[PDB]
Structures are given as C-alpha cells and as structure tokens.
C-alpha cells in the first residue's frame, strides 16, 4: 500500500484520508451488525420477544449506515483508482521522451510497454476491486473479535486469536509462490516481446523457415510460458491450503470457546445459536482473502513496472535558450568524446561549423557519423567535452528550446501508423497549408500524392511498412523540412531513392529559402554537391576536412573514398 500512496497525486490526499476513514467505519458497521444478532436473538427467544425491537432498530441503523459508507467508499475508490491511473500514465508519457537512450534495453523496453499496457480497466479499478475488499476482509474478523469483548471477554480473545493466524497465513502465502509467480511474469513478458518481433520481422523469419512454432523463437517462448503457468498453478496450492487451515483453526477456537462458555453456563443457549451465524460471518473473510491473494501479487508486479519507468534516469537539462530567434546557429564540437558502453565511438572530435552553411560528413560504415548527428540534436550527450550551439552548451539548453533548434532526417525513417499528411504535419502541426505543400513539393512527396489513389490521406502502416523504402524516406524528409528549426541534420536521406529523386531532393535541401545550418551525411558523391565543407570521419576522428574540390586534389582519404 505504501507504493500506492507514493503514486497517489499529492492534491488527492484529502480523498485518501476520507477513503481510509470510511473504510474503517464500514468494517466496524459490518462487525457491529453481526454481533447485534446476539442480543437480538437472546431477546427474541426469551419470555419477552418484544425486547428485540431495540436491537432490530440498532441493526437497521447499522445496516443503513453500512450502505451509505459503502456506496461512498466505492465512489472514492473509483476516483482514487482513476486518479492514480491518469497521473502514472501521464507521468510515464512525459518522462519517457526525456529518458536516456541507453535505458531502452529489451528488458526495459518490455517493462515500459507493459507499464503502458496497464492503462486498461484492471489497474483503474484497483482500489474498488482489490484494496476495498482486501482491507474489509482483513479487518472484519478483528473488528468482530473486538465487538465480542462487549458480549464476552474470553469469547472475543478466542476470536482475536483466530485473526493472528489469518494475518500469519496472509503474510506467508506470498512467499510460498513468490518464485513461481516471478518466473511466470518473466516468461509471459518474453512471450509478448516475441509476438511483436514475430509480426514485425515476419518477412525475414519466413525466408529463414523460423516461422513455425516448432522452429520459431515465439514458439519456444510459448512453450516456456506454458510451463511456467502450469508451475504457477501447482505452487499456488500451498497458499490456498494455508488460508483454508487458518479458517479451520479459527473455527475451532471460535466454536470451541463458544461451546465451552455455553457448557459453563456463562453463555446462553440462544446466544450460542446466534454465535453460529456470527461464526459464519467471521469465517467469510478467511475465504475472501484467499481469493484476493493472487490478485495482490499481480498488482505488486504491475506497480513495480510503473515505478521502474518513473525511476528511469532522465537526460541532463538546463534552462538556457539560444539568443537569436530563428537565426542559423554555429555548431562546434569542443573535444567531444562518446562511448556506447565501454566501446569508444568518438575520441577528441573537435570542429566548428559556420552559421548558415552546409557541411558534409562522409566516411566508412561505423565511423561514427550518425553518432555525431545525435550529439548535435541532443538525442545522445557527450561522455566528455561539450557540443555548443551558437556558443551555448546543448546540455544546458531548455528541453523546449533544445528540440526547437534541430530538425533531423534519420538514417532509418520511421513514420507513425496513420495518414501520410499526419506524418508530415509532425514537423510543424500548426503549419499553414502552403507550408505543408511547400515541404512535400521540396521532398518530392508531391509525386506520391498523384501516384497514390488516396493522395496524402494514404493510411501508412506500422512504421512506414505500407510504403516503399524511398517513399517513406521522402515523407521523413518532408517532415524535417516542414519544421522551421534553424539546424538541419540529414542522415543519408537519399539512400532509398533513385537518381531522379536523389537529384531533386539534394537540390531541394539547398533550395530551402529559410536559413539553416545544414549537416548532411551521405555515402554518395552526388548527395554532397552543395556542401560548403566536408568532414571525413574515420574511426571517430576527423581525418581531413575542407572544400570538396580541395580534398579531391589533395589525393587523401577523401579522393580514395570515391575511387
């Protein structure tokens, strides 16, 4: 429950206190109503049955009050569950774009997906479905044992002693199937990630004959998931038996003391008959707690995943902003070092790029030229050194100002599953229709609109899989060009385009009217014609730089690169 209170909105604590007060009041009303039968039946079986009117009046009041405290407790529990749901999902949605890219391991990616997947009604109704009956069931036999002290002290103590074994069974039950429930969750999440991989990588798996369950990775995950689920069913047997034995032990103490008092004469025969009914009410929570024990464990796993996302390490950020508004900034690396894990990517890369000029980065595969663009855009941050935009360190920039400074065309373009126009409008959702058509015209997406039957309303698939490789690449170019940012990072934006589209796109990047500091990565000579400067990056070091014609005449790596 402490983890839940950690996740409650700070402006919702008034309802939690009110919920906790009414939850206790509901338990006491239920316990008092059960014990009111003992005076009621003793009076009813006596020589003056009219004396039961007083105890029936108090039962009506306790019964009516219980209805009101239970409807209100359900209303507050519904609000608390959905209030907690909205904050956690909104918090995770806001935090995840700021989480460091290294956090997104396959395990953490699976955890984040499953944490987001808990938006359904199961987590929203957590308070009404789990806490309210679990607290009501756990405290009712304790409350009945307290209310029986007013009927008979040794009777209440025997009832209370049966609650010590109830909490003992509750405490120990989770530890009996802790390991099995953990392995079941791991194999279940692993099976989820293989299904998504199965659907995404369907084409490559079919060619490899790794698509049938007897040969696929998802088939192996299904077998492991099934075996873990069957193990969980068997290892939950001690938990349910333990709650049953607690109820059996509780019954003997309650019934044994009631029989002992009645034989002693301290307890009347009608009172003992009324205590059978109280004993049934006293043992109902023992069965209810057993039913809620499996639900308590899955909830604890769910909240751990949500807390894992909220504990994810965010990127360093500041409050600075660029001085000029819309002017092309200068890009410079000041002894920037970067490493993925222990492997060094960049080693002392230093350069300066003039404002409003096009620069080309070329070199072998794996040299580090995609990492350089990510550092400029702020997707990654240097291990040491400092990337500066117009003399301002990027790590000190406002996140709102940092994203507004750079528009990126990524090496592997990713469109969102919607229409083609919506993917272009991601660059600038408030852009006018003239700006959107200008961006699509520049990126040669206007060819697609007439070529395709639906035009820009063409429903793109997951990623951009319902478009060809060069068609979704041009859509990602139109997205970047639509954004009015003063820095453009082009990461092989004509890799999947023919020569006719390569030439038109390359001219379009230069022909963009607004000023930008453009950095272009390409493996084609014809894609860097309009670059004012070139950076030959090899093994994370700028081996040489200068003009395109100058480097060709130098006969260095740049000349041999295109030989």
């Amino acid at each position: 429950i402490r983890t839940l209170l950690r996740l409650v909105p700070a402006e919702k604590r008034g309802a939690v206190a009110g919920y906790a007060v009414l939850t206790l009041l509901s338990v006491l009303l239920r316990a008092v109503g059960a014990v009111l039968l003992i005076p009621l039946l003793a009076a009813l079986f006596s020589d003056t049955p009219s004396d039961a009117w007083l105890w029936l009046g108090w039962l009506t009041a306790v019964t009516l009050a219980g209805w009101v405290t239970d409807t209100n407790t359900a209303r507050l529990g519904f609000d608390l569950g959905f209030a907690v749901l909205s904050r956690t999902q909104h918090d995770m949605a806001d935090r995840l774009p700021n989480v460091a890219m290294s956090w997104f391991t396959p395990d953490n990616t699976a955890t984040a997906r499953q944490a987001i997947a808990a938006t359904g009604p199961e987590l929203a109704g957590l308070v009404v479905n789990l806490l309210t009956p679990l607290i009501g069931a756990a405290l009712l036999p304790a409350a009945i044992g307290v209310a029986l002290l007013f009927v008979s002290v040794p009777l209440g103590l025997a009832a209370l002693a049966g609650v010590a074994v109830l909490f003992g069974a509750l405490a120990l039950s989770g530890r009996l199937s802790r390991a099995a429930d953990k392995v079941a969750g791991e194999t279940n999440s692993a099976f989820t990630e293989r299904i998504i991989e199965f659907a995404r990588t369907q084409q490559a798996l079919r060619a490899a004959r790794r698509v049938e369950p007897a040969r696929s990775q998802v088939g192996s995950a299904l077998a492991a998931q099934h075996g873990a689920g069957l193990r969980l069913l068997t290892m939950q047997i001690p938990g349910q038996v333990l709650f049953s034995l607690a109820g059996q032990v509780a019954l003997i103490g309650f019934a044994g003391m009631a029989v002992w008092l009645t034989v002693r004469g301290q307890l009347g025969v009608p009172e003992a008959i009324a205590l059978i009914v109280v004993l049934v009410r006293y043992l109902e929570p023992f069965a209810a707690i057993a039913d809620l024990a499996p639900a308590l464990e899955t909830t604890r796993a769910t909240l751990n995943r949500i807390q894992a996302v909220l504990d994810a390490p965010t990127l360093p950020a500041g409050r600075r902003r660029l001085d000029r508004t819309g002017a092309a900034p200068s890009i410079e690396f000041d002894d920037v070092r970067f490493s993925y894990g222990d492997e060094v990517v960049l080693d002392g890369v230093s350069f300066t790029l003039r404002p409003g000029n096009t620069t080309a980065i070329v070199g072998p595969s794996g040299s580090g030229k995609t990492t350089i663009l990510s550092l400029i855009a702020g997707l990654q941050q240097p291990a040491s050194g400092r990337v500066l935009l117009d003399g301002v360190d990027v790590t000190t920039l406002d996140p709102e100002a940092r994203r507004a400074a750079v528009s990126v065309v990524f090496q592997h373009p990713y469109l969102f599953d919607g229409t083609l126009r919506d993917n272009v409008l991601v660059g600038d959702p408030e852009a006018d229709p003239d700006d959107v058509t200008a961006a699509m015209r520049l990126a040669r997406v206007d060819e697609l609109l007439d070529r395709l039957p639906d035009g820009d309303a063409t429903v793109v698939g997951e990623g951009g899989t319902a478009l060809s490789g060069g068609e979704r690449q041009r859509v990602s170019i139109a997205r970047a060009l639509l954004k009015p940012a003063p820095v453009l990072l082009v990461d092989q934006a004509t890799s999947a385009l023919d020569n006719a589209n390569e030439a038109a796109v390359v001219d379009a990047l230069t022909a963009d009217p607004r000023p930008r500091t453009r950095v272009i990565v390409a493996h084609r000579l014809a894609s860097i014609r309009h670059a004012d400067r070139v950076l030959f990056v090899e093994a994370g070091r700028v081996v040489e730089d200068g003009a395109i014609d100058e480097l060709l005449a130098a006969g260095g790596r740049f000349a041999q690169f295109w030989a």
Binding site: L96, P97, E193, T201, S365, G366, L448
Partner: protein, 559 residues
Amino acid sequence: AGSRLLAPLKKPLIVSGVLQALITLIELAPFVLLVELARLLLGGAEAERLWTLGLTAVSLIGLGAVLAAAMTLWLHRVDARFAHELRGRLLTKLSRLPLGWFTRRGSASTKQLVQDDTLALHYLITHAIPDAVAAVVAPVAVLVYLFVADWRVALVLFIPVLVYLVLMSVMTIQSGSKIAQAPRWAERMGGEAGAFLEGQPVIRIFGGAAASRFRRRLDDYIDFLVSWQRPFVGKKTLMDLVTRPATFLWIILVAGVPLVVTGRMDPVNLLPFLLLGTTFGARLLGIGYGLSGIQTGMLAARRIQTVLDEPELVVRDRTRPGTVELDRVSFEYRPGVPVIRDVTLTLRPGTVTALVGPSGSGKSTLAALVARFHDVTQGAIRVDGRDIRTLTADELYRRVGFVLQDAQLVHGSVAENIALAEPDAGLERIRTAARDAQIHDRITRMPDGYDSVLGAGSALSGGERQRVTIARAILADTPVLVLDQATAFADPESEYLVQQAINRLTRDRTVLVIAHRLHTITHADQIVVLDDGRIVEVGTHDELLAAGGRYRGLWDSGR
C-alpha cells in the same frame, strides 16, 4: 463463433457443471446440519447427538472446501492447456497468412490476438459454467427449503433477489456496447504505445511528449474507460450491497421479528432463515460479476475463430534447376490499385539481373512475390519449373534466399542472426559468412564476440546491420539469391568488398539485384527497368545507355 472454437472443451465444461452442482449441494449440507443442531440445542438434546451433528457439519465444510479447490485446480489446468494449444494454432495460422494481413493489422493487433484474446477466454472456459450452475442450484435449493420452512419469511427474500436480477440485467445491457468497444481501444492503445517506444527519436526531435499522438490517445482511452467503468462499478457495488449476507439477515429479521413478537411464528422456525437465508447471495454475485467476463470471452472467441478461418497461402498439390520465371505476373496490395502490371521475366543460373527503376515502381513487391509473401493476382511464378504455389515454404525457401530492403534483426546473439536460416550451422561457417559480408571484424571488436545480443539499445549502424543480413543470406547458401537494395547503407569500400564476395559466391547461381546506385550494376547480364509497375526496357548497360530511355535519364541524373 465461440461454440466452434470451444467444442474441444465439450466434456470438461459439462463435467464442471455437474460437479459444481454436487459441490454446492455439499456446501449447503453443513448449514442444514447446523439448523438441526440448533433445534436440538433448544430442545436440550443429549450431548452425543450434538457432537455428531457438529462434527458432521465441520467435516462436510472441509469436504466441500477441498472438492471446490480440486475442481478449480483441474479446471484451471484444462484452461491453461487449451490456451497453449490455441496459441500454437494461432502461431501456425499466422505463419502462412499473406504479409498484407500483418501490414494492415500491425504488431499490437497480433499481440492482442495471440495473448489478450486467449486470456479473455479464461473466465468463459474456467468459471462461467461453474458460477452459473452454483447460482442456479444454491438459491433454488435454499428457497425451496425455506418456503417449506415458512413461506411468509421466504417471500421477503425475493425482494433482494428481484432487485439483484433487475440490477444485473440493466448493468449487462448498459455495459454490453462498452465491452464490445473495449478490445478496439486496447488494440489502438497498444499500437500507440508500440509506436511511441519504437519511434522515440521522432518523438524527441519532433514535438516531444506534449505534441505526441500517444498522449491524445491516452487521454481519449482514459475518458472511454471512465465512461465505461463508472456506471458499471456503481451497479456492481449496488449488486454487492443487495446480495450481501448482512442485507439478507436484516430483511429476514425485519420480516420475522414482527411475526415472533405476535403469536404468528415460533422463533425456532427462524433457525433455517438465519443459517441458510444468508448463504446464496455470494453465489448470485458470482454470476452477476461473471456476465461481463462471459461477454468478453465470447467476443474474444469470435475474433480468434475469425482469424483461424482466414484465407492463407495454401500449398497446391499439383506438383532449369536454379531458374526463376515470372509469366504475365500482376499484383495488387489493395483491390483496384495495381502495382505490378503484366511482368514477364526470366532469371537463369549463372546470370545477374539488375532490377532498377524509379522509387515506388514495384521492385520490392516483385521480390516479395518471388518469396510468396503474397500470391500473384494474375500470371504465375515458377522456380525450377515448379509453380511456387505448389511448393511448401521449406521447398520454396531452400531454393530462394532474400536480403530484404529493411535489415530486420531478431533479438538474440549475432551468431543467431547470421545463423537465422540454419541455426544448427557451426561457428566456423558463421565466421566465414561474416567475413564474406565484411562484418567479422566488427563482431570481433564486440565485448561478447559472436555471442553479443542484438536487442533494443545494443544496436549497430545501418550499414553494419545490413551487412549482418547479407551474411545471413550468404550462410543460407540458396541456388537463387535476391538482394533488395543491398549495400544501400554501405560505403563504397565496403560495398565493393561485399559485392566482390557475392560475385565470388554466386558465379553459378541465379542472382537478382535491386539497386538505385546504377554504377554498381553495369556488369549485370540483364538490366530490367521497372516503371509504374511495368517493364519499360530491358538490355545491358551499354544498350540501355544507347537507347536513350528511362535508364539513360536515371544514369545522367546519377552523375
């Protein structure tokens, strides 16, 4: 179509119903014995009879508990095994549907199908029949017993029962449409979450969290959940209040105390009602809560059986080596939207065919048609003279290997990714294939070597993963090889080295190459220009340059 799906569980479900009838009767018997024990207590009976009745009631409570536990365990095992077999069936079905199914569905839809629908069947095939039989048997038996005991105090028990039935009916009617809409919302939310996680760089550069479609869909889904679960939970709590043992006890006493106080009822006659009249409310609440689960299970069964009935790439039984032949092939991703228009081509062993053309002309879809990811709308495709529809997946993909345009790596070691088409291949073969693809050195530089995992985050550069897929195809070692835009992310040096390795390894093989870089396919035996889904000119490099057609224009644009 839940009956057809759940037919294999015909006998377990009937057994569950009859055994649950027996179990609820055994659970009601202790309270009849306790009523008799109370009657003997008021009569001052000898201690022997009281001990016998008490011990019998306690033993029957224990028996009922152990029998219910055993039945739940057995039925949950039955449900688990059914879910496992059904998931195996679903994976086998999806293994041979057209790829257009996957493209138009998405990964979230597939995950919801294989996992969420099979889990939604759980209540239907594990709890629905037991809950129904318990809620039918226990109230009927108890009410018959209590009407025999006293009809006046038995009639008042119909008030909570009728109120509960009205609440249950209105709750089910109100929540049916929202339950129908729920899986669509879950699928959409899963798709948005998957896109949000996969497209994180696009989110970070463009818009961030605030301007993300994920947050808008999240708000809409939470609004739908609130509108669904608020009246539903209100009705649920009212039903819980109506059927609670306290409510039955209170209304029993309100009916009986005026009777007992007057000379209208002996108090002993209230012993049944206090001991049996408060037993069957929870069993009624079980079905009241389970109606929604039954509805969700029925819809999930309908969806699962709809997918299991889907048309697939059926292998015909109709029933030069190394030859591929497309004969008047046409293809349509969507009906009425042609993308391949009467394409005739022949790839022969010992030759290289370079399929070039404008972006979006249909090169990748033609390659996928050769792979039989989709069936040709018209014409035919033959391999070694055998129509690909007559070949099984093993027969087809042992003859033709593919390097797709998108470098898809599976979660696993680099050796697993290179050995995807032959997981039993030895390490020496994997190393040679990696060397041929100019990727062995990079894998050597990795910390774990060839065991380094290729999941999220621990990725490679684009050229490196493209080379890994090229090594995969090299290790497959098929007589026919297709290379869709291979070496597009490769630098000229790596491109030259891997192309030399491919030429060495496929001298006597059939090779199809798709390349926007026309300077790398001038040596091809045949060059096919595909424009607007049709072949516009075929020839060698010099012949196509002399022709002055689309190839000449693309070549001039490339220089």
